[PDB]
Amino acid sequence: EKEWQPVTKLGRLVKAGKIKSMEEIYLHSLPIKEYQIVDYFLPKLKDEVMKIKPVQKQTRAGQRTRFKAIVLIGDSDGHVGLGIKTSKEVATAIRAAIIIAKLSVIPVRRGYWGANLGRPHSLPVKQSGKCGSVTVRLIPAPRGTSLVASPAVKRLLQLAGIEDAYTSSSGSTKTLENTLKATFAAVANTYGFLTPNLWKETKLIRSPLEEYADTL
């Protein structure tokens, strides 16, 4: 509720306004362990719970029931993430799930289909990912068509900012938890593909942590 006390060196620097934007953290690939960092840089992040499913466990007296919740968040402008947490109470799990989702926010790369006229709308290349017997494939599409996909994965692409795409699925896609984790891995790898327009050499600069001196 009241003002938070930073616990890590990075948290103190953020509170003092010594870093420009979240992409500065992304460029140097620094771990994030405090959820107050994300909402300080990225307000208006929408959250929406997918479903809750019970899980059992056999004991001498009877069966012990817990509730598992899946939550994904995004800003519809290139940032998205999800988190999963289970607990003994339905309400408690949802609150903890939202925290884990914020910690995993990642950027996406958006390109063009054919000729470029500003405001990229689709994926730059075709990418795919696998998470335990489920494979999802994404294909760039021309402007004008909508998203062609199942309702489960259409929501994730909507919050990532991608407008036009083609989708393909394989394996047992009825496992909803596995399906979402496979889509999340495919989008994360867009920046890992080396297109010819990125061949230009870049200049190495020192990280913000090294050249700043923190407060006591």
Binding site: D47, E48, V49, I52, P54, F67, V90, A91, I94
Partner: peptide, 21 residues
Amino acid sequence: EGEAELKDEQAAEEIAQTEKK
């Protein structure tokens, strides 16, 4: 069977918001 507290939750948005008679 987590349907007890959906009447007065207001802390999340469900997919198919149940219309009430």
